[PDB]
Scaffold this active site. Structure first.
Site, PDB file in Angstrom:
ATOM      1  N   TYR A   1      10.494   4.787  -4.485  1.00 53.20           N
ATOM      2  CA  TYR A   1       9.541   5.775  -4.977  1.00 53.20           C
ATOM      3  C   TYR A   1      10.145   7.171  -5.159  1.00 53.20           C
ATOM      4  O   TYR A   1       9.846   7.849  -6.142  1.00 53.20           O
ATOM      5  CB  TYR A   1       8.313   5.860  -4.060  1.00 53.20           C
ATOM      6  CG  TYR A   1       7.359   4.692  -4.163  1.00 53.20           C
ATOM      7  CD1 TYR A   1       6.176   4.672  -3.426  1.00 53.20           C
ATOM      8  CD2 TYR A   1       7.645   3.596  -4.978  1.00 53.20           C
ATOM      9  CE1 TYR A   1       5.295   3.581  -3.494  1.00 53.20           C
ATOM     10  CE2 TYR A   1       6.771   2.496  -5.054  1.00 53.20           C
ATOM     11  CZ  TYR A   1       5.602   2.498  -4.312  1.00 53.20           C
ATOM     12  OH  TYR A   1       4.731   1.433  -4.401  1.00 53.20           O
TER      13      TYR A   1
HETATM   14  N1  LIG Z   1       7.079   0.403   1.840  1.00 54.86           N
HETATM   15  C1  LIG Z   1       5.755   0.469   1.957  1.00 54.86           C
HETATM   16  N2  LIG Z   1       5.198   0.410   3.210  1.00 54.86           N
HETATM   17  C2  LIG Z   1       3.846   0.480   3.345  1.00 54.86           C
HETATM   18  N3  LIG Z   1       2.923   0.627   2.364  1.00 54.86           N
HETATM   19  C3  LIG Z   1       3.519   0.679   1.123  1.00 54.86           C
HETATM   20  C4  LIG Z   1       4.893   0.634   0.843  1.00 54.86           C
HETATM   21  N4  LIG Z   1       5.129   0.719  -0.521  1.00 54.86           N
HETATM   22  C5  LIG Z   1       3.936   0.843  -1.031  1.00 54.86           C
HETATM   23  N5  LIG Z   1       2.905   0.835  -0.100  1.00 54.86           N
HETATM   24  C6  LIG Z   1       1.432   0.953  -0.299  1.00 54.86           C
HETATM   25  O1  LIG Z   1       1.091   0.710  -1.658  1.00 54.86           O
HETATM   26  C7  LIG Z   1       0.818   1.969  -2.340  1.00 54.86           C
HETATM   27  C8  LIG Z   1       1.662   2.078  -3.595  1.00 54.86           C
HETATM   28  S1  LIG Z   1       0.950   1.291  -5.032  1.00 54.86           S
HETATM   29  C9  LIG Z   1       1.429  -0.448  -4.662  1.00 54.86           C
HETATM   30  C10 LIG Z   1       0.333  -1.476  -4.677  1.00 54.86           C
HETATM   31  C11 LIG Z   1      -0.300  -1.793  -3.292  1.00 54.86           C
HETATM   32  N6  LIG Z   1       0.638  -2.578  -2.483  1.00 54.86           N
HETATM   33  C12 LIG Z   1      -1.675  -2.546  -3.438  1.00 54.86           C
HETATM   34  O2  LIG Z   1      -1.924  -3.547  -2.739  1.00 54.86           O
HETATM   35  O3  LIG Z   1      -2.524  -2.132  -4.253  1.00 54.86           O
HETATM   36  C13 LIG Z   1       1.100   3.045  -1.303  1.00 54.86           C
HETATM   37  O4  LIG Z   1       0.257   4.177  -1.474  1.00 54.86           O
HETATM   38  C14 LIG Z   1       0.890   2.345   0.032  1.00 54.86           C
HETATM   39  O5  LIG Z   1      -0.407   2.379   0.591  1.00 54.86           O
HETATM   40  N1  LIG Z   2       6.068   7.893  -7.249  1.00 55.34           N
HETATM   41  C1  LIG Z   2       6.910   6.934  -8.020  1.00 55.34           C
HETATM   42  C2  LIG Z   2       6.066   5.760  -8.525  1.00 55.34           C
HETATM   43  C3  LIG Z   2       5.243   5.069  -7.459  1.00 55.34           C
HETATM   44  C4  LIG Z   2       4.512   3.871  -8.031  1.00 55.34           C
HETATM   45  C5  LIG Z   2       3.539   3.274  -7.022  1.00 55.34           C
HETATM   46  N2  LIG Z   2       2.973   1.976  -7.502  1.00 55.34           N
HETATM   47  C6  LIG Z   2       7.529   7.654  -9.208  1.00 55.34           C
HETATM   48  O1  LIG Z   2       7.485   8.904  -9.208  1.00 55.34           O
HETATM   49  O2  LIG Z   2       8.041   6.962 -10.119  1.00 55.34           O
END
Ligand SMILES: Nc1ncnc2c1ncn2[C@@H]1O[C@H](CSCC[C@H](N)C(=O)O)[C@@H](O)[C@H]1O
Ligand SMILES: N[C@@H](CCCC[NH3+])C(=O)O
Length: 429
Positions: free
Chosen positions: A229
């Site tokens: 990210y």
């Molecule tokens: N390494 C990680 N550890 C814990 N939560 C994570 C993570 N990467 C992503 N997430 C979770 O997923 C979000 C990113 S969007 C990813 C989709 C999410 N897994 C879903 O079920 O809808 C984050 O805000 C967080 O809550």
């Molecule tokens: N924050 C990341 C993307 C996160 C996407 C989470 N599903 C970016 O700047 O590209």
């Protein structure tokens, strides 16, 4: 797996999205929902693509019925509305999508009052509060100016919850790192999770208009596909942008805020010096654990602490080297003043916490719930950075005489032991 999800995956098929060269499906992972390789995926293998026909960026809000009313709203505020809106339409093009979205995340913006008490004295708490408040106003101003007026487009009421919901979705889902695009939401590659495994945050996604998500790592069939990210964010930032943090002590940071007070009898000259060198009346310095101090922090500190005795440096004579001197050092008094000021601020701050670093570390040794875990990691981290800073200036206080200040640097070039210049003087007049 999940009905609502089964539906979402079926919908992507009847859209030309998920075809056959798409090595990944959806599944229930420790981090919510994710993308699991349907078969060995190789580095840079395109995972999935999405038709811009399915984005959710300002360009989409502008091209919808509300596009007009939002015509002058800030990019995000516009998307916020769009989202709250489409989430209500039974005929929405993302009906199955929203039926997949998490109602909440562990971002501090959702934490209860008790949950927040675990971050007592932390910088994160401050930052979260501020942000929550701001978003509130900006959103309440939206209700009275766009939602209520156009009761035709916005049938149902709109609570802060809906707001924070869309705001969170925005800050934890959209892909800002893209050229010509800063807040794009992509329903397919939305489910991609974060992993410290990925150390190449150099865009896992590219634009072709389409969204091509290419896996930055080789994944075996059955395993999860991740991405980075953001390498540069701190744990504080990760904690608020998404609901998570990393164990890496190098993600811990604490930002110091310095300013040239207007009550300073030298405000005008000092501000002139600062700006002439890239710094404003107020300046933020981020201090990361195990990193050397930011360049500019010390010189600005000395500028702040300047004081009457050395105020002569603020004279037009040095306007071309003042910063260089500030960079080297001003004087024992100046240095000693600033050192104490910092050390006191660190001690004072350190005292604002309700747990010792030892207690935090013992807790980490057991099973901690999502939010508590985040609060503990965060506070421990901050305490470490705070202590590192105090440690640094404590040394400085000891080496308070090893530094060669302005005066000394001036007399370095005297030439007391030169020639008997008087012999030539008598050969001259
Ligand atoms: N390494 C990680 N550890 C814990 N939560 C994570 C993570 N990467 C992503 N997430 C979770 O997923 C979000 C990113 S969007 C990813 C989709 C999410 N897994 C879903 O079920 O809808 C984050 O805000 C967080 O809550
Ligand atoms: N924050 C990341 C993307 C996160 C996407 C989470 N599903 C970016 O700047 O590209």
């Amino acid at each position: 797996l999940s009905p609502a999800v089964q539906t979402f995956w079926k919908w992507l098929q009847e859209e030309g999205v998920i075809t056959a060269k798409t090595p990944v499906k959806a599944s229930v992972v420790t981090e919510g929902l994710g993308l699991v390789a349907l078969k060995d995926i190789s580095r840079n293998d395109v995972i999935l693509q999405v038709p811009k026909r399915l984005w959710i960026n300002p360009d989409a809000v502008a091209a919808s019925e509300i596009g007009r009313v939002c015509s002058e709203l800030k990019p995000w505020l516009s998307v916020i509305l769009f989202l709250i809106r489409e989430r209500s339409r039974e005929d929405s093009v993302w009906k199955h999508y929203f039926g997949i979205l998490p109602q909440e995340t562990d971002s501090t913006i959702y934490w209860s009052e008790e949950e927040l008490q675990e971050l007592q004295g932390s910088q994160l708490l401050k930052t979260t509060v501020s942000v929550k408040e701001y978003v509130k106003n900006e959103c309440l101003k939206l209700e009275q100016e766009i939602i209520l007026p156009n009761k035709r487009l916005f049938p149902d009421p709109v609570t802060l919850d809906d707001f924070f919901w869309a705001f969170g979705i925005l800050r934890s889902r959209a892909f800002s790192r893209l050229r010509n695009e800063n807040l794009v939401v992509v329903p397919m590659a939305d489910l991609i999770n974060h992993s410290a495994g990925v150390t190449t945050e150099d865009h896992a996604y590219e634009v072709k208009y389409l969204f091509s998500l290419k896996s930055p790592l080789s994944v075996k069939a059955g395993e999860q596909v991740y991405i980075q990210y953001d390498l540069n964010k701190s744990n504080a930032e990760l904690a608020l942008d998404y609901g998570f943090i990393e164990p890496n002590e190098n993600r811990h940071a604490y930002t110091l805020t310095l300013e040239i007070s207007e009550s300073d009898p030298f405000f005008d000259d000092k501000l002139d010096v600062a700006e002439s060198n890239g710094f404003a009346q107020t300046a933020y310095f981020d201090i990361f654990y195990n990193r050397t101090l930011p360049p500019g922090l010390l010189p600005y500190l000395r500028l702040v602490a300047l004081g009457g005795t050395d105020a002569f440096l603020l004279e037009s004579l040095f306007r071309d080297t003042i910063w260089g001197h500030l960079e080297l050092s001003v004087s024992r008094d100046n240095e000693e003043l600033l050192c104490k000021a910092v050390r006191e601020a660190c001690k004072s701050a350190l005292a604002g916490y309700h747990t010792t670093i030892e207690q935090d570390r013992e807790l980490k040794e057991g099973n901690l719930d999502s939010r508590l875990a985040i609060a503990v990691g965060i506070r421990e981290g901050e305490k470490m950075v705070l202590q590192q800073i105090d440690g640094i200036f404590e040394q400085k206080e000891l080496e308070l005489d090893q530094l060669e200040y302005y005066q000394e640097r001036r007399l370095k070039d005297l030439g007391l032991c030169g020639e008997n210049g008087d012999i030539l003087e008598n050969l001259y007049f």
